[PDB]
Amino acid sequence: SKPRNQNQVMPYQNVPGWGYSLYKGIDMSVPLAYDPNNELGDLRDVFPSAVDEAIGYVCGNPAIKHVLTWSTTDVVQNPISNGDDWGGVIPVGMPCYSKTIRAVTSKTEVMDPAPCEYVANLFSYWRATMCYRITVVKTAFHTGRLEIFFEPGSIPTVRTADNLGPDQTQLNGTIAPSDNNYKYILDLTNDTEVTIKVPYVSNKMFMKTVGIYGAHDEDNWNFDESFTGFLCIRPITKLMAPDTVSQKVSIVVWKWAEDVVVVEPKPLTSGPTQVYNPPAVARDLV
Amino acid sequence: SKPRNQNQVMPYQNVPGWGYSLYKGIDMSVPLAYDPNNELGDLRDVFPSAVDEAIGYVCGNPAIKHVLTWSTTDVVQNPISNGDDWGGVIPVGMPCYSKTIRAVTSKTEVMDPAPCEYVANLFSYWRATMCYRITVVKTAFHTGRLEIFFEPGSIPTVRTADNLGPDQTQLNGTIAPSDNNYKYILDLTNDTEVTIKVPYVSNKMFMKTVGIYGAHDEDNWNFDESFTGFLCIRPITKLMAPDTVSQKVSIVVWKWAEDVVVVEPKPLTSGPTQVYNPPAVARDLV
Amino acid sequence: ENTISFFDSGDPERMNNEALMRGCGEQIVNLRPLLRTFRTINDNWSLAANTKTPITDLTNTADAEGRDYMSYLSFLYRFYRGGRRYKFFNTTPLKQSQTCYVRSFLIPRNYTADEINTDGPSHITYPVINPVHEVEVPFYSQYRKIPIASTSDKGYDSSLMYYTNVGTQQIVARAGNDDFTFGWMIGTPQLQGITKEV
Amino acid sequence: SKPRNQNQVMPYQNVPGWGYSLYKGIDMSVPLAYDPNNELGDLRDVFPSA
C-alpha cells in the first residue's frame, strides 16, 4: 500500500547561477505571467530586416574612416599628410587606431570608431579579412597614377606623450618602396571606385583589440601587436589637373570586414567601456 | 554487493516558489488527505452550464450602460444630453468610462461597470471587437431617422477638476458631420432593435484599461489612449410623434465584446482594486 | 434584429492570434486559470503565538475588496466547487535562536477553533529553513456546490486552522485547486477607486 | 489545468566536491564564456607528437 524509497542520496552544491555569463542553459529564472511558454514570432512584418543583429552584416557594413586631400604639390612616393593625422597611412585591422584628447587639466580621450571597430572593442582577440572602399572624388580631368601598397607588421611611428601617430620620413620612395610589397596602381582617368580585400596573415593566430586605447609614448605595445600591418598610399605621379579646375582632389576610405571571427568578450581595455556622452557645454566635463 | 555512486553533483538553488503567479506547473503544495489524486468530476449535473467561467461568454453577455431620452425639442444633428452625463456620445472600448464622486470633504470615486468592463479592470492591455445593442422604446407612431456614427481617436471633452465628461459644442452637424464617417441611419417606423458590431482598429495594437480611473482635469492621458474612438448619436429628424402620446422616447444601449483578448493582469490603476461596499449609512465612509 | 458591422476587418482570429506573438508571450483564452495563480491578499497579517487561528477569521475581510481574483470574480458568480490552495510566506524578524514550526490543520468553515479536536491531517514547515507554507485544502463538503458567501455555513465545507508557536508576520496568497471553478453567471458590482481628501 | 506533484522527496547531502582528486565525472565547475561546449581539436599540427 505504501513502500519506502529504494533510491540514493542526490548530492547538491547550492549554487544559484552555474552560468550567468554564458549563452545557453536552463536559466532558473522566473517569468511574470501564467505560462512560461510566452514565446513570440519569427519577426514577420515586425521590422524590415533579413537578419540584422550576423557580424558579417555589420562588418559587412561600410563606414568612412578619414578623407585625404591630394593637391598637385604633394610629391611622388611621399604619403599624404593632408586630410588627417595619419600621414596617409592606415593601420589595417579591426581594432581602432584613432583618438584625440578633450581637455578642460583633465585630458580625456575620445575615439571615432566604425562597426568593424565598434565590435572588437567589445571583445579581446580577433581574426578577419578587411575590405576598404577607396573612392576618389574628382572630374574626368584630374588624372594620376596612385599606388596603394601593404606592409606587414609594426610601423615607423611617433610615440607621443599622450596620443599616437605615424612617421612620414620612413616612407619615402627610397626607404620602404612598393616593388617588394603587394601593390595596386589605380589610374584616375575614368576607373575610380576600388574595394581592396585583404585576407588575414600574421605569425600569431589572433590579435588584440585595444589598438590605440590607453596608447601613448610608453604603452604603445598592444598597438604594435593589434595590427597585422598597414596600407600606405603613395602617388606615382603628381596630380595632373589644369588650373581651370581644382588643383586638389579628395580620397575616401571606407571599412568593413569579411570572414570575421572573435574569441572572448572581456576586452583588454585598461578600464571598462564608458561611451562618450556629448556634454551639456563644450567645457562641461564627463 | 554494494557499489559507490557513479553520479554527478546536482546543483540546487533553494527557491520554494519558482512560480506562484503563473497558471501551470507542479505546485509543490500539499493536500490534506490520504491520496493527492483527489480529482473531481467534469461538472455533470453540478450546475446548469455549458461553460460559464470563456470571456466570449461574459464579453458575449450584454449589459446596459445608459439610457438616453429623446424629446421632440432636441434638434437635428445635435447629440442628446438628456438621460446621462455623456451628451449622447459613448467612448467605444472595453475599459470603463463613467464615474461619480461620493462625498462625506473626502470625494471618493465610484463606477458603474459591465462585464466587458469588469474584466479589463483586471488586466492591463486589451483588444476586442464590441457589440452594442441599441433598443428604442416607443410605439408604432414615434418616428424619426436616427443617425449613429463613429469617430476614431480622442474626443472634444471637458476636463473637470475631479471627473471627466464630453463636450457637446464640437459635435454639431457642421463641426464633425457624419458623411465622412461610418454611418447607420436607423428608421423608427417599425424596425427598432439594432446590434452594431465594431471591429478593433487603431495605430497601436492593444489599449490600456484604466479608462476613467484616476481621471480628472490633468491626468486624462491614459483615457485618451484607452479608447479607439467613440460613437455619437445625432438625430436626422426631430422626433415625430403627436401630442396624443409621449413627445419623448427612450434609448437603451447594451454592451458586450466579441473576439476579445487581453495581455497582462497587473492593471494600470494607480492603486489596487477596492470594490465599492455600499456602506451602513448613506453618510458612513468606506 | 438588424445587426451590421463596420470596417470590413479581416478574420479577427487571424490578427490577434498573430498579434500576440507580437506583444504577448502568453495566449489567454480561458479565465479559470487565474484561480490557479497565487496573487496575494494580505502583506502583514501579524499573527500571535501558540494560538491556532482559523483562516475564515481572515478571509472575511478579504472577499470584500477584490484585492485578488478569487474575490473580484466571486461577485460575477455565486458558487464554487474546489479547494483553495493557501500559500503563506514569512517576514517575521526571526533573527533569533528559537525554532518556528508553523503548523496547519483542517477545520470546517465558520468554526471558531475552540470547539474542535485538532487532529487529523496536518502539515509543519519551518520558516528558518523554508519561509513558505503551501497547503492545498481540498473540497470535502457534502454538497454539489456552495454559495460564495452566505451566513448558513455551519460546517458545509473545510478550512485551515493555521497554527503557530510564535508572534509572526506573514505574506499570503490564494488561488484555488486544480478543480476550483465557479457556478452560475450573474451581473457585476460597483467599484470605487481613488479618493481625494479636501 | 494545474495538478500537484505526485513525486517523492529527493534526499540531498550538501557536498560540493564529491570528487576533486579523481579523474572523471561531471565537475560542477563553470566555464567563463557563452557555451560550455568549447572543446578543442585532436592536436593536428599543434605540435610534433604521436
Partner: peptide, 17 residues
C-alpha cells in the same frame, strides 16, 4: 507557436487544469 498549438487543440490546460 507553442501556446498557439494548444489553443487550437483546446487542450485541458487553458480551461483551468
Amino acid at each position: 507557436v507553442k501556446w498557439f498549438a494548444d489553443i487550437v487543440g483546446g487542450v485541458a490546460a487553458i480551461f483551468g487544469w
